[PDB]
Amino acid sequence: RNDRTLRRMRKVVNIINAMEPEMEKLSDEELKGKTAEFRARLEKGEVLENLIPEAFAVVREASKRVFGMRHFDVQLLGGMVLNERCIAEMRTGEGKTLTATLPAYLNALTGKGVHVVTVNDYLAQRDAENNRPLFEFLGLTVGINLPGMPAPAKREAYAADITYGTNNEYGFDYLRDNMAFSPEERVQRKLHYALVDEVDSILIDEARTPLIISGPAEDSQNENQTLASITFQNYFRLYEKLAGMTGTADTEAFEFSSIYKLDTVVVPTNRPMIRKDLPDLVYMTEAEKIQAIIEDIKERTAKGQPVLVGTISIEKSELVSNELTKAGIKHNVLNAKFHANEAAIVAQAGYPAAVTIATNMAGRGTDIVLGGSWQAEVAALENPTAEQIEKIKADWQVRHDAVLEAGGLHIIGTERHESRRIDNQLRGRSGRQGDAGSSRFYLSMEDALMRIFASDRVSGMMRKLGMKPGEAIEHPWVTKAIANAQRKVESRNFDIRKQLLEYDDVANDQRRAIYSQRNELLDVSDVSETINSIREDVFKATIDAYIPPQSLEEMWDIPGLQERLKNDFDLDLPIAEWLDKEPELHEETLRERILAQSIEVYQRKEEVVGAEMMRHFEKGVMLQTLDSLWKEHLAAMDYLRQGIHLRGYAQKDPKQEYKRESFSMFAAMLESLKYEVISTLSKVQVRMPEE
C-alpha cells in the first residue's frame, strides 16, 4: 500500500544501483542509443515497467554527465511512484524537479508524448530549457506550450517527446481542439500522460474551476456566451496516465483518491528528517501567548539559534515585533511592500541568533541557509577572489555548524491556520535536507482557531487547566485534539465539495458523450452513412407527428404534414393528391414515397456541386449544428443547476431530479441535432441548371 509498494520499489533501486558500473563505461553516444534500443524492445512487445531499471540508470548517468547531478535513491523511488497513478509526496528541498526527469523519460518512450504541467509560464519555459540538454543527450525532443503561441508552433510542442506548459494552456488547447472543423487543425495528440508539478493547487484547489471559451457567436446588440467548457478535474481525468508531485504538504490524500483515483505515496527523504516538532502550547490570552513567544525567542537567540516567526496578519506581525523590541531583541520583519529588503533579510535569516517575523508565510519559500548564505556574501563582492572566497566559506562553516549545534532553525507559529497544510508549510521551512531544527505553535483561548471546536463552553474548559505564567506543563493530547479538529474541518468541507462534484459529473458525462460523437465525425471525410441513417430517423419522427403510426386515414393530418415538409425540408409534395388518387397507398408506402423524394431532390443538388463538396458540406453542417446546440444546452444546463434549490424536496432527492431533467434535456438535444442537420441539408438552396 505504501511500504508494500515501497519495499517492492527498493528492490528495483538496488538493481538500478547495481547497473551504474555498466552505465559509467558507456559512451555519450551509446547512452543516446539506449532510447532507440528501448523503443525497439517495446516494439517487439516488452512491458514498459520492465525497462524501469535500465531506463532510470540511463537517465541518472545522463544527468551526471549533463547536469553534474546524480539522482539519489529516493529520487529513483519518486520517479517510480510517478509512473503509476500516484501522487509522490516528496518533502521541500528534495529535488522534485530532477526527480520528474525520470518518469518523463520513461513515459516518453512509447512515442505518445508527455505533458509536464506547471503552475505558470516562467517555470514551463525554465524547466524546458533546463532539461532540453538532458533529453537531447538521450535522443528526445522537448516542447514548450505558451498562450498566444500560434497553432503550428503548438503542434510542434505537442509533437515533441516531452512537452511543458501550464494547466491552463493544456485545458484551453483541448477545448479549441473540440471546436476544430478539421482534424488537421487539432494541436494536441491523444492525452497520454500528465505529470503535474504541484498537485495541491492544480488538482485540488483548482479541481472545479471551469475553463471556458466564450464568444459572441450570438447567432441571434449581441452578448457573450460559453462555447466550450471543462473543469480541471475533468480535463485531467481524460488522460490515460495521471501523476503528480507535492511536499509533505498532505492532509488531503483521501481527496486525491475521490477526485482522481490517485493513490498518494510518501516518499522518504534522502537524509533522516530530524526536525523536532514540539507540542502545541495553549494560553488563556493573546498577551500571555505573546509573552511566551518572546521568552522562547529570548532563550533560543541567547544560545545562537536563529528563529523564524510566522503570523497570520500584518497587525500580528507588528505586535510581536514591538514586543520583541520592548524586550531588546533585534529582529527583522518581512514587509510585503519592500521586496528587496525581504530577499536581503531572508538571506541572513539562518545567521546565528537571527530573528525574522513573516506574515502569512507562502508555500516552499526561499530556503534558509543555516549560518547565513555565504553565496550572498560573494554575490556582494565586486571582485571576488580565491583566498577571499575560501575565507568566507571557512568563516561560514563555523557559523553553520554553530547554528546546527544550537538546534538549527526554530519555527514559531504564533497561530494555527484553519488548514493544517498551511501550518505544515511554515514548519517545513526548518529541518530541510537533514538539518537540525524545531517548531512550536502557540494558541490562545482567544485564537480564532479555537472556534472550529464549534463550542464556547467546550473550548473554555481549557481555562480550568490554568496556563499559569512561566509554569507551563505541555499537554500533547492538545496537539492531536487540534490536529483532529483541523481534520474534521477539511472533511466537512470536502463532503460539501464532493456533493458539488456529483452535480459536475452530470455535465462531465454529457460533455464526454458529445465530444466523442463530435470527434468521430471530425475523424472522417465522408459522413454519408450517418446522414442517410438520420434522414430516415428524422422523416419517421416527423411523419409520426401527423400520421400516428398504424392509425386510420381519418386521424392523419396531411395538411399539417404538407406544410411541415414545405416549411422545414423545402419539400412541397401533393400528398392529399396521392391519397385521394391511389386507393392502393397504405401508410407504409406513403412514408417511402416521401423519403425517396427527399433523396432524389438531394441527389440533384449533389449533381450540381459535386460529391466531394457535398460530403464536406455535410460534415461541416453536422459539426456546426452540434456546436450550436451544445452551446445552447450548456446555457440551459447552467440555468437548470442554479435553479436546483427548490425543485426536489418532498422525499425526492434534488438530483435524482436534476439527473432526470438533465438526461431528458440531453436526449432531446440529440434528437434535435438530427432534425436540424436534415432540415439544413434539405433546405440548402442550390441554383439548378436544366436537363
**Residues of each annotated binding site for ATP:** 75, 93-97, 367
Q: How far apart are CA 431 and CA 425, in angstroms?
A: 12
User: Which entry of ligand ANP, a second copy, none binds 286, CB below 5 to 8 A by partner kind?
Assistant: none
Q: Is 93 in the site for ligand ANP (CB under 6 A)?
A: yes
Q: How far apart are CA 262 and CA 674, in angstroms?
A: 39
| Rounded least distance, CB 363 to ligand ANP, Å | 9
Q: Is 469 in a helix, a strand, or coil?
A: coil
Q: Is 382 in the site for a second copy (CB under 8 A)?
A: yes
Total residue count of the chain as it appears in this document: 691
Q: Is 59 in the site for ligand ANP (CB under 6 A)?
A: no
Q: Is 403 in the site for a second copy (CB under 8 A)?
A: no
Handedness of CA 80, 85, 87, 93 (dihedral sign): positive
Q: Are 162 and 133 in contact (CB under 8 A)?
A: no
| Residue 246 or 510 having the CB closest to ligand ANP | 246
Residue 279: is it exposed, middle or buried by C-beta count within 10 angstroms (0-12/13-18/19+)? middle
User: Which entry of a second copy, ligand ANP, none binds 672, CB below 5 to 8 A by partner kind?
Assistant: none
- Name the residue type at position 52: I
Q: Is 415 in the site for ligand ANP (CB under 6 A)?
A: no
Q: Is 376 in the site for a second copy (CB under 8 A)?
A: yes
User: CA triplet 484, 486, 490: central angle to 5 degrees?
Assistant: 115
Q: Are 414 and 480 in contact (CB under 8 A)?
A: no
For residues 352-385, b (16+ Cβ closer than 10 Å) or e, as one string? bbbbbbbbbbebebebbbbbbbbeebeeeeeeee
Residue among 1, 25, 44, 326 that touches a second copy (CB under 8 A): 326
Q: Count CA within 13 A, CB hemisphere, residue 650.
A: 0
Q: Is 94 in the site for ligand ANP (CB under 6 A)?
A: yes
Q: Are 105 and 95 in contact (CB under 8 A)?
A: no
User: Which entry of a second copy, ligand ANP, none binds 670, CB below 5 to 8 A by partner kind?
Assistant: none
User: Which entry of a second copy, ligand ANP, none binds 149, CB below 5 to 8 A by partner kind?
Assistant: a second copy
186 contacts: CB under 8 Å, gap ≥ 6: 177, 180
Site map (CB under 8 A) of a second copy, residues 139-178, x = contact = -------xxxxx--x-------------------------
Q: How far apart are CA 17 and CA 56, in angstroms?
A: 10
Residue 226: how many other CB atoms lie within 10 Å: 16
Q: How far apart are CA 112 and CA 84, in angstroms?
A: 16
Question: With contacts defined by CB under 6 A, how many residues of the chain interact with ligand ANP?
Answer: 16
Residue among 77, 100, 102, 123 that touches a second copy (CB under 8 A): 123
| Residue 249 or 449 having the CB closest to ligand ANP | 249
| Residue 165 or 352 having the CB closest to ligand ANP | 165
Residue 50: how many other CB atoms lie within 10 Å: 11
Provide the grid cell at 477.
493530547
Q: Are 96 and 78 in contact (CB under 8 A)?
A: yes
Task: Give the binding range for ligand ANP (CB under 6 A) out of 94-102, 261-269, 423-431, 573-581.
Answer: 94-102
Residue among 12, 33, 95, 593 that touches ligand ANP (CB under 6 A): 95
Task: Give the binding range for a second copy (CB under 8 A) out of 100-108, 170-178, 343-351, 590-598.
Answer: 343-351
Instruction: Measure the CA dihedral 270/1/207/258, to 10°.
Output: -160
Residue among 339, 566, 581, 604 that touches a second copy (CB under 8 A): 339
Q: Is 656 in the site for a second copy (CB under 8 A)?
A: no
Q: Is 324 in the site for a second copy (CB under 8 A)?
A: yes
| Rounded least distance, CB 567 to a second copy, Å | 44
Q: Is 378 in the site for a second copy (CB under 8 A)?
A: yes
Residue among 26, 42, 48, 69 that touches ligand ANP (CB under 6 A): 69
* Contacts with a second copy, residue ranges (CB under 8 A): 119-123, 125-126, 146-150, 153, 318, 321-326, 328, 330, 332-333, 335, 337-345, 365-366, 375-376, 378-382, 384-386, 389
Catalog residues that contact ligand ANP under the rule CB under 6 A.
69-72, 75, 90, 92-98, 198, 245, 364
